[PDB]
Amino acid sequence: KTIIINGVQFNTDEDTTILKFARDNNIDISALCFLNNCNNDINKCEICTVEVEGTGLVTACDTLIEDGMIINTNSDAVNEKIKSRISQLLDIHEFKCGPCNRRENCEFLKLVIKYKARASKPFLPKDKTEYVDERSKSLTVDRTKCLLCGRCVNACGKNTETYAMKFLNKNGKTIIGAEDEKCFDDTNCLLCGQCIIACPVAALSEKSHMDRVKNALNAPEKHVIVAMAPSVRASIGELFNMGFGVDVTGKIYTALRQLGFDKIFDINFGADMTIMEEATELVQRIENNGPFPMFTSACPGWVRQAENYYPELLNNLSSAKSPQQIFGTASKTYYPSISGLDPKNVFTVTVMPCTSKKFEADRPQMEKDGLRDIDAVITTRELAKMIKDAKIPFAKLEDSEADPAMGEYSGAGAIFGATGGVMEAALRSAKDFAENAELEDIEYKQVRGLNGIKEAEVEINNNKYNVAVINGASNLFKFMKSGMINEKQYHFIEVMACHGGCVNGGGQPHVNPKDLEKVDIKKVRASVLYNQDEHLSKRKSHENTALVKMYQNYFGKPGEGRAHEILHFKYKKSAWSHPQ
Ligand code: 402
Ligand code: SF4
Ligand code: SF4
Ligand code: SF4
Ligand code: SF4
Ligand code: FES
Ligand SMILES: [Mg+2]
Ligand SMILES: [Mg+2]
């Protein structure tokens, strides 16, 4: 078919939208509410307006190309329409970029600047308290920034299929929020924060823990531990203009020391701990023939999904604590035993690509003897802001090293942040455990990649077992609802709520939609992790020397005794009751 765009003739067989055909041919069209191959069906932002000859102004993002269209993307009538829409958005928008947390990478600001748009009347609310919801342990809303673009609603729908983020009719006016405007925590919401990632502005954010951290750092008698997740070292460089897929591990350690932290450890150490315990439990369940299947339990997004939708699976969850919590538990017990610190004075902070980790850390029973496993969780974005506020030249920092005692990690722990990561690492140790051997082939490439549902057959000690990797919360629903779970007998199942794994977590750096169609963000971030695994000497969690010492000298044998006593956590379904 033949179309004309800005006087340029195209002959094409492609059946796509104006927007995508234009972007494919280096023709500029703006968009706002269009994301994840979806726009806002009930309140189209119309930022993507173009002029079609013989029709008038149309939305490019959801209008298919047709033979014989004459399209103008830059006529004065088009630009005045787009400018008008942005101005109306400004009319309901607290335009104060100064102290805003999206100041450095906001899509809306870029649009305002591009079209020179201004409000008819500035939005200047005196009392923000009614626009702000900070009840959640993981999420916050600032409706002074909200454009009602529906991108959070669509993303929540696509990524989780819970539809926990909804349009609401609050006293005759439209907002976004949880069901019945309740606290997100009190709904079926997973707190995975995929909504935040989709948000073009600062309307959706993580629940801040930065005050917890600063207060602890400035408290004389507090000994503040910090440990970052696998994914952080593969991501945080993005916010310092270092590009995508840059390993910045050593720079992070240096920055944390300069921030005033008293001990620099690593969650990857906790990852090796979780494998120690979970691979042990797997081997146990084999020689007890059940309960099968065993599900991973390190994703609090998935744990909440199970609690809210599949409580019959809670007893199938591994009882091993997550790397975050299992690390935290040892930081209040083992670490004092090798440091002399009063356990009460230890304050443990993690850096996570995740918002759901904050909820996990603040679970009432995630403590012992009055001591929280984890006292604070800051996202990748929060650590970045903290670094920038301290004016630490991150990109120029020299590499330092972590403190070894709870900072060493194997290549198995290092790949936790990728979908299929926990599966692969668990298998490397479960195999060696069950066969009493030191096997050389350790790469399970079949469980890797961005496929939503991944299965593999594995041969453990002259017996064959079935594993599955569930990549994304919506895929958990598909896997269960479509009866896939009953099509064969599964023995070990990994579930991550965020598609791509933690590298694509709700607390990660935002990425411009244009960059998203240019960079495979999930694969590129994960590539850093697998790279570290490939070039590390020890690639099994039980080959972690610092970890072995810890178990030999303090916890004893994994999966039992002291180790099972305090390094494990069991989820329980509510007892039957009526009503509901
Ligand atoms: N706790 C824990 Fe995990 C580990 O190790 C993280 O820290 Fe993850 C990452 N990156 C997060 O958030 S959680 C899910 N298990 C996969 S990776
Ligand atoms: S959300 Fe964007 S446009 Fe609005 S105040 Fe913040 S930086 Fe400025
Ligand atoms: S919270 Fe963000 S993504 Fe959701 S409607 Fe408001 S501006 Fe759009
Ligand atoms: S945190 Fe996750 S489940 Fe909850 S509303 Fe946001 S995207 Fe949906
Ligand atoms: S996949 Fe990772 S980042 Fe996403 S909710 Fe689970 S633990 Fe958090
Ligand atoms: S981007 Fe097309 S209507 Fe919003
Ligand atoms: Mg649409
Ligand atoms: Mg201090």
Author numbering: 2 to 581
Question: What's in the article?
Answer:
The strongest impacts were achieved when replacing E279CpI for A or Q, or C299CpI for A or S, resulting in activities <1%. Interestingly, the crystal structure of C299ACpI reveals that the removal of the thiol group causes an additional H2O molecule to occupy the vacant space. While the additional H2O is expected to rescue PT activity, it obviously does not restore enzymatic activity. Thus, an alternative proton acceptor has to be assumed. The additional H2O molecule (Wat962), which is trapped in the space of the missing thiol group of variant C299A would be a plausible proton acceptor. As it is well-positioned to bridge the adt-ligand (distance 3.4–3.7 Å) and Wat826 (distance 3.6–3.7 Å), it seems surprising that we are unable to measure any significant catalytic activity. This could be due to an unfavorable pKa difference among the Zundel-ion-like complex, the uncharged adt-ligand and glutamic acid E279Cp48. We assume that the proton is trapped in a Zundel-ion-like configuration with a dangling H2O molecule Wat962 downstream of position A299 that prevents E279 from being re-protonated (C299A).
[FeFe]-hydrogenases represent one of natures’ most effective classes of redox enzymes catalyzing the reversible reduction of protons to dihydrogen (H2) at turnover frequencies of up to 9000 s-11–3. With their low catalytic over-potential, [FeFe]-hydrogenases represent excellent models for a regenerative and likewise economically feasible H2 production. Their active center (“H-cluster”) can be structured into a standard [4Fe-4S]-cluster ([4Fe]H) and a diiron site ([2Fe]H). Theoretical studies suggest that the most probable PT pathway comprises of strictly conserved residues E282, S319, E279, and C299 (from surface to H-cluster, numbering corresponds to CpI), including two protein-bound water molecules (Wat826, Wat1120 4XDC19, chain B) located between E279 and C29915,16,20. In this study, site-directed mutagenesis (SDM) is used to investigate the PT pathway of two [FeFe]-hydrogenases, namely CpI and HydA1, which represent the largest (M3) and smallest (M1) type of monomeric [FeFe]-hydrogenases, respectively.
